[PDB]
Design an enzyme around this catalytic site. Structure first.
Site: not given
Ligand SMILES: [Br-]
Length: 208
Positions: A96, A99, A159
């Site tokens: 995602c 991240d 995510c």
């Protein structure tokens, strides 16, 4: 905006058993090399029995494996996603948008990140180092956030809702058509990067 609830729930979702943070950082550093990671390699780095590595990973439901049973994905992944995450001469991917903002500090390396706006398809890119972001293109880039769930798979609940957008107004227009998502919010990529920094500080403080 107030970011405490996001930090608290992501930590709760990520840190399910003792040793998770101890394992996660070495794992990300190994995956960033661009090849599948064996449990024995992790065991050796950590000084753990391979069984214990297995036990931590077993709680990590979303973990991706290859045909050999080696680890290929845990936040950072070798399997194609919408979020391209390049370290030197190795092309990796991330689960995602948030991240991509968090991993550079944990790995200790600068990454070239690229994706496409979830609302318009326009290409987006930036350079993410452990301490700052640069070359944000386009400059007004934004990120969507939701509140992570504690007893759900992190990819399905968090995510898949956390994207990059070309701008804040573009993201807000998109968000107006997305009701019933707990804690849905639009922030600038700068605010998202700061959230990542605070998450990392708390995570690292729980390691050995
Ligand atoms: Br709060």
């Amino acid at each position: 905006m107030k970011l405490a609830p996001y930090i608290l729930e992501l930590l709760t979702s990520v840190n399910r058993t003792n040793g998770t943070a101890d394992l996660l950082v070495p794992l990300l550093r190994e995956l960033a090399k661009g090849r599948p990671v064996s449990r024995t390699t992790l065991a050796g780095i950590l000084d753990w029995p391979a069984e214990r590595v297995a036990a931590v990973l077993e709680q990590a439901t979303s973990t991706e494996y290859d045909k050999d049973g080696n680890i290929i994905g845990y936040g950072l992944t070798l399997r194609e996603t919408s979020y391209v995450f390049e370290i030197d001469d190795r092309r990796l991917y991330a689960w995602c948008a948030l991240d991509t903002l968090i991993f550079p500090a944990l790995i200790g390396r600068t990454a070239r990140v690229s994706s496409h706006c979830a609302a318009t398809g326009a290409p987006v890119s930036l350079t993410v180092s452990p301490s700052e972001i640069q070359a944000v293109e386009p400059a007004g880039m934004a990120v969507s956030l939701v509140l992570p769930q504690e007893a759900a798979d992190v990819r399905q609940s968090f995510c898949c809702h956390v994207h990059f957008f070309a701008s804040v107004p573009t993201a807000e227009d998109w968000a107006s058509k997305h009701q019933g998502l707990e804690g849905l919010a639009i922030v600038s990529v700068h605010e998202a990067f700061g959230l990542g920094q605070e998450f990392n500080r708390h995570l690292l403080q729980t390691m050995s």
